[PDB]
Amino acid sequence: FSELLDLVGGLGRFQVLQTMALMVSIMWLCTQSMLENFSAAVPSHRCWAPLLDNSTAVSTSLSPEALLAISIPPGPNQRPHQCRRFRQPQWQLLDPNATATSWSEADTEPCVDGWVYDRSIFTSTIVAKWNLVCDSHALKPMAQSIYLAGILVGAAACGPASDRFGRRLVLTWSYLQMAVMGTAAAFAPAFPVYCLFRFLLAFAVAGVMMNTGTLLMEWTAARARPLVMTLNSLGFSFGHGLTAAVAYGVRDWTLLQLVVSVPFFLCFLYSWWLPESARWLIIKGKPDQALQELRKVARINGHKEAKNLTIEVLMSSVKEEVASAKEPRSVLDLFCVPGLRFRTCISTLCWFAFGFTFFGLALDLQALGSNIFLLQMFIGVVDIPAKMGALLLLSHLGRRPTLAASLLLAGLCILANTLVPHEMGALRSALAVLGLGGVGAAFTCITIYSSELFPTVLRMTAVGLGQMAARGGAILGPLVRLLGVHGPWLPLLVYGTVPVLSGLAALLLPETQSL
């Protein structure tokens, strides 16, 4: 097949333009995925109390601190209890002579009158709008997990649909669905509707990712292919910084969601100018349309070759693809081969570790540090050089030590956040940034490495297994946080042990550098 690109030009003006456009689309995609850090931030909260909140009631010489103590008992975090209040005002607690032994838990009640939230940092968030707190605290990670599960469903759907309807058309309708579902998610009235709309948005996102990957690889020459995939991965690194920049200015989750959704309308517009997959069309036996697209691309590259192509070379040079694609090969076939089974196990577990760790950590930054805006921007800042160095090291030390070191370093960096004492926020934030950068480098390493571990026929199906495993682990990511009720060390230790274990497994993979 390559000869057609070598004729039309495999890395010309057209490829540069298309790469820039799809990288921009991925930037906005990353903003969409990161948003739940800022759209669902948990502001500090307490029960509503008659003395504290009824501004028309009798004011007194007592300051707000003393009244707060008179109204609400202390919680485990050496801070006001976040879910219950005193049944009757504890005037006896005004004195320093008082002791907490004076009040029974029977003297306390849950927030019958609802909650009061801090508005200083975020003006409005999902948590404060639909009271996803206390008894309902499980629902926030539930929302994140549902969003991530929509991606698994979307991939399983968009595979067949993309083959039936073509890459560009599915990408276009995916952009449109992202726009419509996202703007609806901003205005939605009630939490079930928000869950539904986030799920459909995930259904769109899966298609965007898969079809972008397919479209870039088809039009890119073989030797430049890893670099193009690396740029597609750097799009997310820039997306982190974009999320920080947007969230700093916009503090209202309705407006934030609306702002990050609208740009996808523009992608719907300019995706109409991009060309359809040539290989898909030729497989569909339509050489006239494929040749129209090809000579259009050649015109963009300014070549003379528009006068030289014929349908016979177009069809014949793809005859091998047409013949080989007929075979009934899927995941079950991959598991049969004696020499491939161990490779499959370890590769799948590496994808699983990536999804698990990244979507566990990157969506609750509020727990890893002290200022989530700067933490987001620094995740971007560290991810960029981490991925570029990952490429520059992967091409020299071999896939095996590069991937193994990436995963092991990421896991050990995250584990360090358990051991460093809670109050040292600066060092903890730095370690968290480094760990997430390590996971990004591991993503690049595994993307390139998995493509080489398998024979050319099974390559794409094995990559499919890997991606599905990554999404499966991402779904479990958020649920791990529910264990945090028993303490913060347990969720973070679970997040840290898995990537280290998979890294020690990655060390056993066969090398594939051209040694």
Ligand SMILES: CC(C)(Sc1ccncc1-c1ccc(C#N)c2ccccc12)C(=O)O
């Ligand atoms: C889960 C994956 C494998 S990826 C994905 C899906 C949804 N949200 C974000 C990402 C994502 C996470 C880390 C990356 C890194 N480094 C990255 C790079 C490029 C594109 C997406 C990601 C998929 O379903 O395809």
Ligand SMILES: *[C@@H]1O[C@H](CO)[C@@H](O)[C@H](O)[C@H]1NC(C)=O
């Ligand atoms: C607030 O205090 C005023 C004081 O006159 C009272 O009339 C009113 O019922 C109170 N409302 C609430 C909700 O506490």
